[PDB]
Ligand binder design. Structure first.
Ligand code: SF4
Ligand code: SF4
Length: 77
């Protein structure tokens, strides 16, 4: 699954929204949060993010693997 990280934070972004096949893009008020566990491993949202920052959970660096955990955790609650 593909997940947001850090160069995405920025008080009410709107791009990775009405594109996701399975509507698994959720706000953490400031920024969107992808449920990796609902995301069907596509590549649309990244291509849409006008920064290029959404990477595979595996690919996101260990420093930022914290966000993969957070993204997981958000909805596993
Ligand atoms: S488009 Fe990019 S910057 Fe915006 S919320 Fe999504 S991932 Fe974050
Ligand atoms: S990669 Fe696709 S399925 Fe996954 S969150 Fe992004 S748009 Fe949705």
């Amino acid at each position: 699954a593909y997940v947001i990280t850090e160069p995405c934070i920025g008080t009410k972004c709107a791009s990775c929204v009405e594109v996701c096949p399975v509507d698994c893009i959720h706000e953490g008020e400031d920024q969107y949060y992808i449920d990796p566990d609902v995301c069907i491993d596509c590549g649309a949202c990244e291509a849409v993010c006008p920064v290029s920052a959404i990477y595979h959970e595996d690919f996101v660096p260990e420093e930022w693997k914290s966000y993969i955990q957070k993204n997981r955790d958000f909805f596993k609650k």
